[PDB]
Structures are given as C-alpha cells and as structure tokens.
C-alpha cells in the first residue's frame, strides 16, 4: 500500500487529517481522521478559520436530502444540512463512493484556527451517527459499494509555529512496513466506539492494583480525535501519584500535571529517565490472555516550543481526567500501528516504525498474560428508559 503511506499530516495537538475529494469535478478538502465519531462533515459556509469551504452548487454530482443535523458536545457544536455525493481520497484506494455528507453551515468551537482541516471523517459505527443510527457512515459505505476490505490501520507519528505531524491511513490493509515485531489483537466488546477491555495498568511496572472494572469506567475507547491519554477519575489519581513518585527529584507546579502549564529543560538535556513508562493490558481474543502496550514520556509529554524560551524544550503533560471513560487518544496511538479491524471485530497493535523513543526504553506490545479465571473488566452502562425505550428494526 506504497500509495497511502505518509498520506496524513496535522499540526500537533489539533488533530491528524486526510485529503479527500468531494463532488463533481472534485473538491479537494483536508479532513480530521477520527476513529472517536461517526458522520462525514464538512465545512459548507464561510468561517474565519477556513480558507476553502464545500460548494455544493459547483457539484454535479450532489444530492440535498432535505433534512438537517445538529451536533452539540462538550463545549462546541457543529450543525448544516444532509445530502451525498462523489466522495474519493486521493491518497487511498482507487475507488469513488456516493456517501452521507453533512454540510457544516454553523459552528461554535469546531473549526481549530490554523489545524489545516475543513472536515470530519468520523470512522466508528452508525450507532453514535447523528441525528440517528440510520445516517450511513462513510467507510460502511466504501466497503458496501466498493471491493476494499472491511479494515483499516493507523500510524500516527508524533519558533512561531506548532510542530508538524505526519502519519499513514491505509484503508482496506495491513502494511507490514509500518511496524516492527507482533501484531496483537483486542477485541472490540461493542460496535459504537470502538470500544476495547483493560485489565491491568501498570506505571513504571508497578500494578495500580484496582478493580479492573474501575479501568473501563464507563467504558475505554481508542480514539483517534483525541489527543491524550485520558483516564477515569479514580484511575486518573492513582497515575499521577505514582508518575509524581517515580518523577519525584523534579519538583513541578500543580499547573503542569493539571495540563495547563509548561515544564522546561535546556535543550537536550530532558531527563527521561526520571519519568516512568505506563503499560495497560488489554483483554486478549483468548478468554483468559492479555496483553500489554506500553507507552514512554516521549509519548505522554508533548513537545510545546516557546517564543520567550526558544533554547529550552519544553513539554505539556498530556494524560488527563475523564468523566466518560478511558480514552485512547494520539498519546497511545503515536506509539503503535493500529490495525482497526471490523471484519473480526478487532483492534491490533504493533510497535510503529515511527514512535519516538531512546536508546534505553522503546514503547513495546508483549504478550500473552495469562490469568487463572480472570475477571469481567468491563462495565455495564445503566439502561436509561431514553435508550431502553428506542426500536431497532
Ligand atoms: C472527542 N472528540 C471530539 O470532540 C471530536 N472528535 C472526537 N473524538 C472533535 C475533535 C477535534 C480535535 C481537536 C484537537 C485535536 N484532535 C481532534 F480530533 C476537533 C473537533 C471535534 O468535533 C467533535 C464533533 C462531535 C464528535 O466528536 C468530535
Ligand atoms: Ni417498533
């Protein structure tokens, strides 16, 4: 797949995107790869932030659908009208499909000024789609009307200006080039998010010792559109605890491991040995095996270059709080090729060719862990009448 190796770039922190063509004759637009939600949208009005914006009435091709889509989050909201057309990614498969295309025409906090993107491609499943599960998402699409494989893989490799990332997507395959060493699977429990099982946290080899089920509280996804380990309260404290310990010769204001402040060397002179490595077991396709991923502060310190202090490096801790579960976001994913697998409903990790790293310590995928009659880790979302209450014909 020599065609979509390096085919993704970003600017750290805001998000690794993908060319894509939409319409007729193609309009070329730079889309946010995000395994964390599940609707094509695209910017389709002006906005400060964007230089270029989907025409609809330059293509052939579209389709308006009469219907329109509101999406609010946490602290932002996108919203514009539904319709398809003639969708391609240049740097993917020869293949063009008719998707679901969400005309993003009002935003509040969505568009990120200077990332470079102008869309989303949400690539998890039709069950979190807006406005309901019946809105196709893209890569259902491809593989309906097109002969590509139903799998897709991520490498994501991590003065005035945020530094530049760059990665691969390879849709429909497994590049063996862009990893090193065994490639191991985590099932996927449920198809929403893509949604994975930990059984074990480690931090510097030494076991958090919680519930398991406290790992996945209220559940763990892996998240391309999130750029840091996230963790559960409870879980969250225990980390930074032991992390403060093993670190302990330092001396950091509570601003940085809150994230919201810089921590500073002179330049080369980081100290990575004081921080420790985190290693999270994820459940095995084997009822009873795990195994471990684990990540470096090369990963979970990101680079910040400062204006006031350009001979110093310095560094952002970025794994925080979560209330709604475990996130995988660029902070594990910058360490391993991550084979998306919906034909085994499956999630793979190898050691990335790309993981920055040093000549003591490498981020590592090793296994199997075997658990005499291991526990149920996962949790089990209480049923609102809200959701009880809907129909799936
Ligand atoms: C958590 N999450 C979002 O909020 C989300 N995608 C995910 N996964 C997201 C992430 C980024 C973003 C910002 C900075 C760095 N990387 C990124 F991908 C930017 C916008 C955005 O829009 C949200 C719309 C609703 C669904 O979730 C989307
Ligand atoms: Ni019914």
Same mark, same amino acid.
């Given at each position: *797949?020599?065609?979509?190796?390096?085919?993704?770039? $970003?600017?750290?922190?805001?998000?690794?995107?993908?060319?894509?063509?939409? +319409?007729?004759?193609?309009?070329?637009?730079?889309?946010?790869?995000?395994?964390?939600?599940?609707?094509?949208?695209?910017?389709?009005?002006?906005?400060?932030?964007?230089?270029?914006?989907?025409?609809?009435?330059?293509?052939?091709?579209?389709?308006?659908?009469?219907?329109?889509?509101?999406?609010?989050?946490?602290?932002?909201?996108?919203?514009?009208?539904?319709?398809?057309?003639?969708?391609?990614?240049?740097?993917?498969?020869?293949?063009?499909?008719?998707?679901?295309?969400?005309?993003?025409?009002?935003?509040?906090? *969505?568009?990120?000024?200077?990332?470079?993107?102008? +869309?989303?491609?949400?690539? @998890?499943?039709?069950?979190?789609?807006?406005?309901?599960?019946? %809105?196709?998402?893209?890569? #259902?699409?491809?593989?309906?009307?097109?002969?590509?494989?139903?799998?897709?893989?991520?490498?994501?490799?991590?003065?005035?200006?945020?530094?530049?990332?760059?990665?691969?997507?390879?849709?429909?395959?497994?590049?063996?080039?862009?990893?090193? +060493?065994? %490639?191991?699977?985590?099932? =996927?429990?449920?198809?929403?998010?893509?949604?994975? =099982?930990?059984?074990?946290?480690?931090?510097?080899?030494?076991?958090?010792?919680?519930?398991?089920?406290?790992?996945?509280?209220?559940?763990?996804?892996?998240?391309?559109?999130?750029?840091?380990?996230?963790?559960?309260?409870?879980?969250?404290?225990?980390?930074?605890?032991?992390?403060?310990?093993?670190?302990?010769?330092?001396?950091?204001? #509570?601003?940085?491991?809150?994230?919201?402040?810089?921590?500073?060397?002179?330049?080369?002179?980081?100290?990575?040995?004081?921080?420790?490595?985190?290693?999270?077991?994820?459940?095995?396709?084997?009822?009873?095996?795990?195994?471990?991923?684990?990540?470096?502060?090369?990963?979970?310190?990101?680079?910040?270059? #400062?204006?006031?202090?350009?001979?110093? #490096?310095?560094?952002?801790?970025? =794994?925080?709080?979560?209330?709604? +579960?475990?996130?995988? $976001? @660029?902070?594990?994913?910058?360490?391993?090729?991550?084979? *998306?697998?919906?034909?085994?409903?499956?999630?793979?990790?190898?050691?990335?060719?790309?993981?920055?790293?040093?000549?003591?310590?490498?981020? @590592?995928?090793?296994?199997?862990?075997?658990?005499?009659?291991?526990?149920?880790?996962?949790?089990?979302?209480?049923?609102?009448?809200?959701?009880?209450?809907?129909?799936?014909?």
């Amino acid at each position: *797949f020599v065609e979509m190796v390096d085919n993704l770039r $970003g600017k750290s922190g805001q998000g690794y995107y993908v060319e894509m063509t939409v +319409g007729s004759p193609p309009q070329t637009l730079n889309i946010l790869v995000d395994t964390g939600s599940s609707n094509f949208a695209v910017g389709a009005a002006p906005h400060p932030f964007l230089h270029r914006y989907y025409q609809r009435q330059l293509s052939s091709t579209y389709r308006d659908l009469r219907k329109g889509v509101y999406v609010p989050y946490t602290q932002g909201k996108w919203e514009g009208e539904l319709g398809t057309d003639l969708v391609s990614i240049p740097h993917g498969p020869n293949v063009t499909v008719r998707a679901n295309i969400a005309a993003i025409t009002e935003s509040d906090k *969505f568009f990120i000024n200077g990332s470079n993107w102008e +869309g989303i491609l949400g690539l @998890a499943y039709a069950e979190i789609a807006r406005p309901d599960d019946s %809105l196709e998402p893209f890569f #259902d699409s491809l593989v309906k009307q097109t002969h590509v494989p139903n799998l897709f893989s991520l490498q994501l490799c991590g003065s005035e200006v945020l530094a530049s990332v760059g990665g691969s997507m390879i849709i429909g395959g497994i590049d063996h080039s862009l990893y090193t +060493g065994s %490639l191991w699977y985590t099932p =996927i429990r449920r198809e929403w998010y893509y949604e994975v =099982i930990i059984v074990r946290v480690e931090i510097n080899g030494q076991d958090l010792k919680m519930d398991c089920k406290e790992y996945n509280y209220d559940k763990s996804i892996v998240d391309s559109g999130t750029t840091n380990l996230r963790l559960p309260k409870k879980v969250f404290e225990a980390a930074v605890k032991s992390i403060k310990a093993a670190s302990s010769t330092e001396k950091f204001p #509570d601003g940085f491991w809150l994230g919201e402040q810089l921590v500073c060397w002179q330049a080369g002179t980081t100290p990575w040995n004081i921080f420790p490595v985190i290693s999270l077991y994820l459940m095995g396709e084997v009822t009873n095996q795990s195994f471990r991923i684990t990540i470096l502060p090369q990963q979970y310190l990101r680079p910040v270059e #400062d204006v006031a202090t350009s001979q110093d #490096d310095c560094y952002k801790f970025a =794994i925080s709080q979560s209330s709604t +579960g475990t996130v995988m $976001g @660029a902070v594990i994913m910058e360490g391993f090729y991550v084979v *998306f697998d919906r034909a085994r409903k499956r999630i793979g990790f190898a050691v990335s060719a790309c993981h920055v790293h040093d000549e003591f310590r490498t981020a @590592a995928v090793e296994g199997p862990f075997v658990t005499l009659d291991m526990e149920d880790c996962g949790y089990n979302i209480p049923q609102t009448d809200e959701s009880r209450s809907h129909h799936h014909h």
